[PDB]
A and B are shown apart, each in its own frame.
Chain A
Amino acid sequence: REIITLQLGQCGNQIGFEFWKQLCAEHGISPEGIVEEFATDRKDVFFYQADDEHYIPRAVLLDLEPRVIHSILNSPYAKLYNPENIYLGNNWASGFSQGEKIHEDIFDIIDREADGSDSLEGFVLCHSIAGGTGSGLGSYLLERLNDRYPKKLVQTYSVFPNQDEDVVVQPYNSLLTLKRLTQNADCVVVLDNTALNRIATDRLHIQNPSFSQINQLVSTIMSASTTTLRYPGYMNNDLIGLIASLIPTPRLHFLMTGYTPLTTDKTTVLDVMRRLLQPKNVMVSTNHCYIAILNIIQGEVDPTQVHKSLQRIRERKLANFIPWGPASIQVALSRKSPYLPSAHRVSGLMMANHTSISSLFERTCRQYDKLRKREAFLEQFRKEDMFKDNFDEMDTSREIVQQLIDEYHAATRPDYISWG
């Protein structure tokens, strides 16, 4: 149904602005809010239908100590949204405490938007893990949202902070945030900073301006993830029906994404399926094996070729995953959007549950434990101090993420009747 977006963190507000700009360009919308002259397709999930058919984006921007919001302010696209949903230290506990005291008015804004919406389906989160101000306050808001609304869905888009080092206290912050994400979120879309950075340095020749490109990448991914809802077909035109297949168990809810063209500015679907199963098209980094794989295709498709392609790729066994049970690949189809020039119009997406990200989490589990053992890297922050004088919440999150890694490695085994 109707989904409200929340955006917080500097990179999160960047990709939210880019996402809304991308959808305004994608649909028949002017940057004033007015419907375009040449506008069939649904805008009834993320866009409020206002008085002059003004598709006002259903978005709530949360920030504290604004810097980039001023750059949002002086824009022609500052008249598309902001019906006054904008509300004005780099520690987790700092942002937690600051969000604690102003929980009421921002929750009042959320309830205001819930009253403004006729229906409700979910709150999708734009998040940056260990982004400083975004950390802690984002976990706090996630806990509040799970508390107040036990009937709605929570989706999280976030990047995982790895740049091969910087901040000595960020693994603690990301560990607490991951503990909150495991318990207080329903489904998590995971992203890696170094992987997207490497792809940006790969297909292009940039080294510094990675933000401006990665915004485009995440915007394309997120819009692709929502295209079958935005452009109505009839397979999984609800969020919940899509998410139900992707989550095999409530302990594994992290989703790996790709994108079939690394650059798209006339191959068949058979080729790009083979491309997508190659890991260079995969944008998120014993044997690691998928549990369940889904793919979504949008382009110029012949309907017989997808069947024979599934036959041939099934027989070729390019799906290097061994499950513990009956779970298999799932196909889906979406519409190519108008008004956008696309060479090689076939474009696909993948949503798969893969165990390999455990190793990435294990990297942080190694790092944090190392800095815990030497104990010269907690640095004695005061917000961390009165929030927890004994710092046993870090031990609690360490316990949870250990259980999580064990659940991962039990899922790697060909039986999940045994647990980890």
Chain B
Amino acid sequence: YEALRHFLLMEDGEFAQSLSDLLFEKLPGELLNPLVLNSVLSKALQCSLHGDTPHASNLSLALKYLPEVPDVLSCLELRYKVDWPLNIVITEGCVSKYSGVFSFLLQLKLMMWALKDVCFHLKRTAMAGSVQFRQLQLFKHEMQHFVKVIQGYIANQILHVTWCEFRARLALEEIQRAHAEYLHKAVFRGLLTEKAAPVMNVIHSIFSLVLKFRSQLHPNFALMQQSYNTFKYYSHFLFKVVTKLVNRQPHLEDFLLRINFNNY
């Protein structure tokens, strides 16, 4: 469990931080052969001094669908397999939900990649001071705080509070039930549930807008100001929609912590 966790909820650092950065240089016509996608995970493992395991074997990176390649959608699975007497406890239905949440967390890493890109693209233009420069960098710092608060919500819920349990929940059927409950709470706190689906609907707008801000590179300052204003409006509307669902969730309460700490 604490082996598969490192790969499918990314508890191994500078493995995710080395996988994602390399993957996003491509995005395609590339990433179709199993010689670069199968080796980039092996490249990510050596930057973290982890591996030489029977968990390192049966690591299969694969796409569930071929790319049709802004587009903020992608598919990517990472699959781990076991043999016969442990197949009955860890099934093919649980690992499917593990690959479901892993894609979600990787797409969250795409955010801190893209804002890092714009930070670097601004770094190469950073000499002489002007108004456009400071008023431009506030967009980057602004979006960086917002991705840090949604990342911190994930960083507390699926990553800390649900991991304290399932360390004595095991103490033959009970193991299957405990594993399924732990995974069910992981997909429950991920807000991929249909009750919390309208919150997830707001997430795509923010994701698309910061990918738009990446695309723009002072040639067109007012365009960037307009996109910034729409971003601020969507973040303002998120505060209302998460407030409305308090009347009709203990796991969402932490969300109300992060998006609401000082300045309405």
How far is the CB of B246 from the nearest CB of chain A, in Å? 14
Centre residue among B10, B126, B262 by max chain A CB count within 10 A: B262
How far is the CB of A154 from the nearest CB of chain B, in Å? 12
How far is the CB of A26 from the nearest CB of chain B, in Å? 17
Residues in A neighbouring B141, C-beta threshold 8 A: 247-249
Q: Assess whether A307 is in contact with B134, with CB atoms less than 8 Å apart.
A: no
Q: Assess whether B160 is in contact with A306, with CB atoms less than 8 Å apart.
A: yes
Q: Assess whether A303 is in contact with B164, with CB atoms less than 8 Å apart.
A: yes
Mark each residue of chain A from 146 to 158: 1 if its CB lies under 8 Å from any CB of chain B, else 0: 0000100000000
**B interface: dominant SS:** helix
Residues in B neighbouring A238, C-beta threshold 8 A: 14, 17
B233 within 8 A of A: no
How far is the CB of A238 from the nearest CB of chain B, in Å? 6
B45 within 8 A of A: no
Residues in B neighbouring A304, C-beta threshold 8 A: 161, 164
Contact flag A234-B10 (CB < 8 Å), given A251-B134, A307-B254, A328-B261: yes
Near B by CB (< 8 A), chain A positions 387-420 give 416-417, 419
Q: Assess whether A240 is in contact with B263, with CB atoms less than 8 Å apart.
A: no
B51 within 8 A of A: no
Q: Assess whether A303 is in contact with B160, with CB atoms less than 8 Å apart.
A: yes
Near A by CB (< 8 A), chain B positions 15-57 give 16-17, 48-49
Say which residue of A42, A44, A329 sits within 8 Å of B261 (CB atoms): A329
B185 within 8 A of A: no
Centre residue among B119, B131, B145, B257 by max chain A CB count within 10 A: B145
Near B by CB (< 8 A), chain A positions 300-351 give 302-304, 306-307, 310-311, 314, 319, 323, 325-331, 333
Near A by CB (< 8 A), chain B positions 121-149 give 123-124, 126, 131, 134-135, 137-138, 141-142, 144-146, 148-149
B163 within 8 A of A: yes
Q: Assess whether A233 is in contact with B13, with CB atoms less than 8 Å apart.
A: yes
Q: Assess whether A234 is in contact with B11, with CB atoms less than 8 Å apart.
A: yes
A44 to B50, CA, bound (A): 13
Contact flag A419-B145 (CB < 8 Å), given A306-B156, A314-B261, A329-B261: no
Which bucket holds chain B's interface residue count? 35 or more
A42 to B115, CA, bound (A): 27
A325 to B144, CA, bound (A): 13
Say which residue of A237, A244, A250, A310 sits within 8 Å of B17 (CB atoms): A237
Q: Assess whether A244 is in contact with B13, with CB atoms less than 8 Å apart.
A: no
Mark each residue of chain B from 155 to 198: 1 if its CB lies under 8 Å from any CB of chain A, else 0: 11000110110000000000000000000000000000000000
B112 within 8 A of A: yes
Near B by CB (< 8 A), chain A positions 105-125 give none
Q: Assess whether B257 is in contact with A310, with CB atoms less than 8 Å apart.
A: yes
Say which residue of A247, A249, A331 sits within 8 Å of B134 (CB atoms): A249
Q: Assess whether A244 is in contact with B119, with CB atoms less than 8 Å apart.
A: yes
How far is the CB of B62 from the nearest CB of chain A, in Å? 23
Write the chain B residue with the least CB distance to A331: B152
B116 within 8 A of A: yes
Q: Assess whether A42 is in contact with B262, with CB atoms less than 8 Å apart.
A: no
Q: Assess whether B142 is in contact with A235, with CB atoms less than 8 Å apart.
A: no
Say which residue of A244, A325, A328, A417 sits within 8 Å of B149 (CB atoms): A328
A241 within 8 A of B: yes
Q: Assess whether B152 is in contact with A330, with CB atoms less than 8 Å apart.
A: yes
Q: Assess whether A232 is in contact with B13, with CB atoms less than 8 Å apart.
A: yes
Q: Assess whether A323 is in contact with B13, with CB atoms less than 8 Å apart.
A: no
A245 within 8 A of B: yes
Q: Assess whether A245 is in contact with B131, with CB atoms less than 8 Å apart.
A: no
B77 within 8 A of A: no
Contact flag A250-B149 (CB < 8 Å), given A232-B14, A328-B262: no
Centre residue among A150, A241, A251, A326 by max chain B CB count within 10 A: A326
A residues apposed to B, CB below 8 Å: 40, 42, 44, 150, 232-235, 237-238, 240-241, 244-245, 247-251, 292, 302-304, 306-307, 310-311, 314, 319, 323, 325-331, 333, 416-417, 419
**A-B CB contact pairs (8 Å), 15 listed:** A232-B13, A234-B13, A237-B17, A244-B119, A245-B148, A250-B137, A303-B156, A303-B160, A303-B161, A304-B161, A310-B257, A319-B262, A326-B142, A416-B138, A419-B131
Q: List the 6 closest pairs (A to B, CB-CB), nearest first.
A: A234-B13, A303-B160, A237-B13, A328-B261, A232-B13, A303-B161
